[PDB]
Amino acid sequence: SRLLIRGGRVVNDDFSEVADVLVEDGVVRALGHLRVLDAAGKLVLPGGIDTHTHMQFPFMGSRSIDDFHQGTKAALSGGTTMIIDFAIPQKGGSLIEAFETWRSWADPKVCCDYSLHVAVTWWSDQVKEEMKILVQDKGVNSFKMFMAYKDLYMVTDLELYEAFSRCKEIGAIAQVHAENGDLIAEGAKKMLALGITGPEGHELCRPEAVEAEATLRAITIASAVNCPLYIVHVMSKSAAKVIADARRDGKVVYGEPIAASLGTDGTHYWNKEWHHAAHHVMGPPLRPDPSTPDFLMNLLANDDLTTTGTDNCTFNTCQKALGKDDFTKIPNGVNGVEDRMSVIWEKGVHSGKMDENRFVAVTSTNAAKIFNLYPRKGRIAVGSDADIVIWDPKGTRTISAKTHHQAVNFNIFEGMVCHGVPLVTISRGKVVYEAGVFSVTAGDGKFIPRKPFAEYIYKRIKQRDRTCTPTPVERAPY
Amino acid sequence: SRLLIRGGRVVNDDFSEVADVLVEDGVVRALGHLRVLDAAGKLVLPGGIDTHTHMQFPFMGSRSIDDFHQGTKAALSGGTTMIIDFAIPQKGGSLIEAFETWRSWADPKVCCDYSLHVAVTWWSDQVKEEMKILVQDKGVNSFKMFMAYKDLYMVTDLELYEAFSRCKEIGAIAQVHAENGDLIAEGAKKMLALGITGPEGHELCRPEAVEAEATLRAITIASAVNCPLYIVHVMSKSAAKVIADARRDGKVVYGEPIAASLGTDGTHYWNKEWHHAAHHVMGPPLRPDPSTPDFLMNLLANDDLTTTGTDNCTFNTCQKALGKDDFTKIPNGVNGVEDRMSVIWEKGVHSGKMDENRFVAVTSTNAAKIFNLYPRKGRIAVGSDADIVIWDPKGTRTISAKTHHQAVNFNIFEGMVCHGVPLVTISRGKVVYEAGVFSVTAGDGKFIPRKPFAEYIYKRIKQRDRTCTPTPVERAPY
Amino acid sequence: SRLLIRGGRVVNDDFSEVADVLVEDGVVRALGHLRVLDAAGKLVLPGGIDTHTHMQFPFMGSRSIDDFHQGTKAALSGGTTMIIDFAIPQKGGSLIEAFETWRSWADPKVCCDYSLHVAVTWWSDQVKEEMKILVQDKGVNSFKMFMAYKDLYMVTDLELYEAFSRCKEIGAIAQVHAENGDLIAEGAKKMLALGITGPEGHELCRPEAVEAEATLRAITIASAVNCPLYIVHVMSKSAAKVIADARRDGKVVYGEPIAASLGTDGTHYWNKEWHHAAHHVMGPPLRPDPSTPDFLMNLLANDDLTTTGTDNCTFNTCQKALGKDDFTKIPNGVNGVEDRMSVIWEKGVHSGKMDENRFVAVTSTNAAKIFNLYPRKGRIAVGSDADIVIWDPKGTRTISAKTHHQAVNFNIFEGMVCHGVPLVTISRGKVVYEAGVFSVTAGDGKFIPRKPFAEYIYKRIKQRDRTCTPTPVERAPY
Amino acid sequence: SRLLIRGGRVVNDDFSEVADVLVEDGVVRALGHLRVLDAAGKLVLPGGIDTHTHMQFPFMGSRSIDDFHQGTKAALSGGTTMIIDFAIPQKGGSLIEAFETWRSWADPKVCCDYSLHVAVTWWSDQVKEEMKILVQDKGVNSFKMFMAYKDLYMVTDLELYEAFSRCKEIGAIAQVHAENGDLIAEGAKKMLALGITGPEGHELCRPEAVEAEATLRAITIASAVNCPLYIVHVMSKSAAKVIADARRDGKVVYGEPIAASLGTDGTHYWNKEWHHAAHHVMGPPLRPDPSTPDFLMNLLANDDLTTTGTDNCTFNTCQKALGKDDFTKIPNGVNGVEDRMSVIWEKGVHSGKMDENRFVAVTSTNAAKIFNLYPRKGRIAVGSDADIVIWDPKGTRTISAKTHHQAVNFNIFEGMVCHGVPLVTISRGKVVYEAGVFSVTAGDGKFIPRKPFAEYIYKRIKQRDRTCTPTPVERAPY
Numbered sequence A, B, C, D: 001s002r003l004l005i006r007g008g009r010v011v012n013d014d015f016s017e018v019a020d021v022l023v024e025d026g027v028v029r030a031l032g033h034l035r036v037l038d039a040a041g042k043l044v045l046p047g048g049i050d051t052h053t054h055m056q057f058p059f060m061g062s063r064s065i066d067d068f069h070q071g072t073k074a075a076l077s078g079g080t081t082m083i084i085d086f087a088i089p090q091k092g093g094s095l096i097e098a099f100e101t102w103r104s105w106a107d108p109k110v111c112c113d114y115s116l117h118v119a120v121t122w123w124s125d126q127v128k129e130e131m132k133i134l135v136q137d138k139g140v141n142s143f144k145m146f147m148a149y150k151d152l153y154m155v156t157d158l159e160l161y162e163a164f165s166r167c168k169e170i171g172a173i174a175q176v177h178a179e180n181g182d183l184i185a186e187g188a189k190k191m192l193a194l195g196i197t198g199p200e201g202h203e204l205c206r207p208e209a210v211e212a213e214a215t216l217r218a219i220t221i222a223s224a225v226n227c228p229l230y231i232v233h234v235m236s237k238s239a240a241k242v243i244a245d246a247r248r249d250g251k252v253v254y255g256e257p258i259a260a261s262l263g264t265d266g267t268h269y270w271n272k273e274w275h276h277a278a279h280h281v282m283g284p285p286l287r288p289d290p291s292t293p294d295f296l297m298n299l300l301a302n303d304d305l306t307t308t309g310t311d312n313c314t315f316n317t318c319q320k321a322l323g324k325d326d327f328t329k330i331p332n333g334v335n336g337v338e339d340r341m342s343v344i345w346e347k348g349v350h351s352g353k354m355d356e357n358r359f360v361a362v363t364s365t366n367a368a369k370i371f372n373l374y375p376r377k378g379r380i381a382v383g384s385d386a387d388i389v390i391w392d393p394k395g396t397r398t399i400s401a402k403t404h405h406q407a408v409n410f411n412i413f414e415g416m417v418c419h420g421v422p423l424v425t426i427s428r429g430k431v432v433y434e435a436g437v438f439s440v441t442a443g444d445g446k447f448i449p450r451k452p453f454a455e456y457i458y459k460r461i462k463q464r465d466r467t468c469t470p471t472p473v474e475r476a477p478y
């Protein structure tokens, strides 16, 4: 019922100090200098917000083995107290129907708080209306549109134009999967026609130019409509370089690198054992440039990239095996939900690239601001939800598929020694993870709704309507 | 019959020296230290090759007043001895039919040598075949595809993919008009709905982001197919910046800035008199950034941009007036064919940005190499065609619509004082322009055919097939 | 004694909400939803922190007319409640002596809170020691070194190396004036030898390449020593572009653009009236590129540049006249202290480039974090000092030397219409400015000391010692 | 006496065609379609010009084992028919004396034609005068200045300013070794104080930021004086990126990457065997970024970098051993003179990055133009010197220290399989290398003098004096 985190160092996005945290009924009630936790010499961080998960997802052939129960269980064991999953309807399928379906899958299963993005996979007047209802009635402020996945989720530039316009009118952010779907389709034919059936052909048919082209296109469509943009799972230096320069030019665009692209690379597609390479297959692919994790982390520290996801969409080895003779038939997706925090602490904080405060912003706070959850989440303050992690920076931890809490039998961070270990995870004011032991039950986590027009992204969009709308030049008629 | 240019300084792309030029039967027969021309203290340059003209073109509502006779007459008066015009078929129209039509318009009219680009305005198996015939039988090695002009010339990314693939197979270069046609259409609705009916709305509906987006897309499609790319009338810093970085990354792409974007800007769209602003309307628009001419010239000097055109598509004031209440109904196109050389000499050579040798490369030689006309044109050497200009760098010249030789009653370089005056223009070994006086008759100029697989662009494309084609990773079956 | 700001919208760096502010004994004591101020429909912002002023400074020939009383009076009338001035010793002069001198000038005069940077104008073991005392005993955490001003303040690269090393050891940030002092000296000879004695020669002898070169050098020296860097009065796109890319590469460097370079340009050096041009003379100069204010503001909004100063160093027209026949004899410095906030609100917030929250960070909060004043200043929170401005974004205001509160008889923002008017300025919990009327007395403002090792800049520097220190490669002896 | 190269494909910088070469008395006398050489299916290229060698150089402790006889013998065996070595005087030593000394070492030894750069290692009025004599009387048009090597060759920014000014007045190009000598000295102390005595400390004390900083500085000093700049042995992406952008901005600067930085990297400094790492030690160091050779080659193909050297300064294993316990005492320098052509053909031409024509420009022609040797060298034309290589692109060749013709017992390209084999090398119209066999004697090669004001670099510098010199703004006296 009551928690007292004592002698710990409370670390937020803006500031850190030595203070004590009094938690009551799921909320931080006090800060200042029946259970007491000794956090001396340790860090008291807001719980991680993973902005990108795909739990139990019927994708291509099958569903991902990490479901909303085990996936959140694994999230909590890693320091992440909130996931934002995607409600994906089929072409011609209802958006509200997909949202309700995804809720019934998650509500009784989830162990930590969660919310939902909704994908606009096709376009009509019916989609246009369903978007407004999801914002007003269901608590949705984000919509994902696909530039990749031809004949599955892909939309044209006109449909991107329309979808962004609608996002603007109803106060939602636009999310885009930036890859040229026409090039990935024609490229995949070429690779198979050349006899490259392995996972290396997956990356080879989608070089980073394809990712970067679509990224700039998304940015250009969004800028022409004055709609705030969010670029999901940024994988390449080129795509990141585009987002960085766009923001430099004053475009309202935000980049989300994932654990995968910050912790490992795409050289693993060329690995001699098929299963190793197949377990790295996702969209966009991991890049065969070993200096990518370094570059992506650098921009993230500098706020050129701002939020962090995992794109967690895990498949077993035998599940991945569905594309053993055809790389297009491999279920796309990798692990990340559990290890995100540690991977970023090790590769980002311990490496000297960013503060502990930047780490908080990058794993929690920036997500809260963008998806309108601040300061309810992403902050340890009076009134905020008690999603708290007691973090030991000094201690080490080895990532292994034999020791992790994910359902997948493979880890892309296998063997990685990470500084920063979550000793205690607190979700909704209740200790749910402590030294390998869970204190959670299914359905304890709750869906939390989000309001439109997030000030962090929309306040400067609204001014642009007022003052960047052009006016005619007064002339005499010819 | 015989010409002896004496005491002149012969300036090529690579080298310049004091030498005498002996011309016989239209060909330079000798170089070394019945008519003799005193070129002492003056420059002997290869005649300009304008890579981009649209003479007597039935565009939107009407035809351009500069036809193949007056347009070439004006070209010769400015130092340009060759034009490469565009054969534009309508959607559903035959390419060979358009080529033959454009030939019958030009052949009896042209005063200087010429050739033709052919536009791929739609896509089928019939277009696919007609492209091969134009290369084998008609002497065409270049095809223009449109990313702009929706419902008129626009093609999709798949059609760009296919059109580039065909250009590669038959040994032709791909030309692209890089502007997002979907954005220009939706943008134009917005401007008129806001009541901006003047020429300023033409630029406002197509900001340089739109040009730059399509440029990168073209480059990305071309790079994925391994097809050499040529970007016509580059207008913006952003689009030029994309081409520069693409070439830096090793992409086979060439940029063609035009006289308009090197000599003037787009601030003139905001001019108080409608006709002034309307006479600057073209696609892409001139940019409202006064530092554009400086930036474009800089890259041109550095070979980031390589060739020069004019996009000469001139309309009278009353012709332009067709869009007096609707900027979309204004015939697009500006002057340039005559003034190109002087504008570039003044803004490029006299300003200290480039050599006289770079000027030759940039107005003649680079065009020859790309369109397979080197060393027949773009060079003063034994065997080369006698397209020669005696050029005075020291003397000045004022550009005015009241004194020029173009049919258009307006000049976008009006009032510009230019160093570099063409004293004598020699076409096909015959003096055709001398101190304001013409010595030409209609049909004197001749169509010159071009062969496929230009070594300058294709030799390194052919190697990429051989060594950049990926190979499978030898693995045991799972 | 007690202030109650009611119905206002409290705007911080991270967040804004409708709340009431209870101020008691100079400190914000409460927040939540004998004098009451109606702030309905208005903004409640933390008072501006100007990071760069030079009040009553005996520079070149004379002293600046804006002294610590009138200068702070003017600061408060503009929304700035704190100034950080510079204690400049002469070559061979004591640093502690200059600090004490500058304190005795300011303490009885200042109307708002203040602190001091100290300049390292020469190097020895005595300077090395005096730096440690200023940090331990005097509350200094910042030192300015000069790359410009030969034979006056300039230090060599070795001395920059040593000065940065000392800043690191004692926990202070290094400030640098980035301009090549050797080039500015040789350049100034050339201009006068050419007969350019006017203010245009001041800019012409120091093109932005000179500023950019020194900026990169400073960054390189600082990076090699692992010392946090601060670049004062950034004036050019090139210098800003260097800082932006440096931070992108993970260098600990911060950029401070000034009101002058955000509100006006350097085209004014070419103005027909001498006094106009002379009143724009400073180091580095304002740039003759009209698009500079736009570019600098853009990066500032994006956090590529982070803090804001004014370099306020104002001279009367007749004072500036000392260099009427020799631009080197013109007292360098321009106005800014009063107008900073409004200039940035108009050019930055109202233009749609940044949030109101970003504006707070950029005029106050980021300064606090860097110079270790957060959250005591730059934030409206329980415990923070009551430096508060009631700000009207809707209302307008014209800047004029005839209506401003600065001692200088000239304003470089003359005629600028600015949105964002300070209705009420609160300093140390006391209303000191209200609708043109002052409620302050001399010496009311107080010097506030700063502690070393500011977590915002040093926490990631300290990690780099631990993990970026190289180790030998274990080898057998040859 | 007479050579007839038959059925070969003559490849120049601008053009290639099937033709026959008639060589008489050391000069190409004819081109068109007692010894005849069958060059069918092979390439006829101009002989390589290596712009950077240091034969038999008393550097640090000893002299390099490759002397002017064996070094040129090795050059010819690789396809290089000309070397341009450096005459390095000591501080206080005469420049003309060093030039004459270097001539007496080379004249009786050299097997191929050569010329000399002269280093300005110190500055006075005596150096100032000696520079003019070397240009007028000795045939020197290039001077190397050092930003690195403190207390040995280093000069200050003022001395760089003066040295560039003199280069301009006498019509010579300025060469600079761009590395911050103050940082390399302080860095080297730090590494040894940390106990890093191996070759890895050589690179670690000079990260590429140091190289890049000095490069930009050199460019800035040169641009302020209007003196043409040449940057020797470019090693890093950063330094190359600076040169590329400088040229893009219109600065007259040329970059010279070397065989070492195009063929290998600096990861070899971390090799477990000391001798391996020591044999890679040079200034600036090879970079620990494996993607460097790729990036440098890319820019070279694009003309961002233009010429090619080797910095050939070879030491035996036991010679290098002088710094076995102190990396500062290792004789700096690596091999390259022989393998340059093949390394560049393999990594540049065969890889599809550049043409065969670009290869000619990059190994020969561009050097000729810059150092005023065109078209006498770098071109196969009537009148040009018969420095010719019959080149087989189809055939392969393995580089090994056991099979090469250099005196050094180590090769940094060891094991590299290279396409492009020199079958026949012709020097001064005489076959000197054929299938492993030499037909040369010592002193056969001859020193060839160079004239000042090379049109390729100076024609646009001279215009800048005329039109970029600022003029006063006409004003009334205040």
Ligand SMILES: [Cl-]
Residues within 6 Å of the ligand: A073, A405
């Ligand atoms: Cl478990």
Ligand SMILES: [Cl-]
Residues within 6 Å of the ligand: B073, B405
């Ligand atoms: Cl006429």
Ligand SMILES: [Cl-]
Residues within 6 Å of the ligand: C073, C405
């Ligand atoms: Cl007053």
Ligand SMILES: [Cl-]
Residues within 6 Å of the ligand: D073, D405
């Ligand atoms: Cl031998």
Ligand SMILES: [Zn+2]
Residues within 6 Å of the ligand: A177, A232, A233, A283
């Ligand atoms: Zn996705």
Ligand SMILES: [Zn+2]
Residues within 6 Å of the ligand: A052, A054, A233, A311
């Ligand atoms: Zn996803």
Ligand SMILES: [Zn+2]
Residues within 6 Å of the ligand: B177, B232, B233, B283
């Ligand atoms: Zn066009």
Ligand SMILES: [Zn+2]
Residues within 6 Å of the ligand: B052, B054, B233, B311
């Ligand atoms: Zn056109």
Ligand SMILES: [Zn+2]
Residues within 6 Å of the ligand: C177, C232, C233, C283
């Ligand atoms: Zn300063």
Ligand SMILES: [Zn+2]
Residues within 6 Å of the ligand: C052, C054, C233, C311
């Ligand atoms: Zn200052």
Ligand SMILES: [Zn+2]
Residues within 6 Å of the ligand: D177, D232, D233, D283
């Ligand atoms: Zn060197």
Ligand SMILES: [Zn+2]
Residues within 6 Å of the ligand: D052, D054, D233, D311
């Ligand atoms: Zn050298």
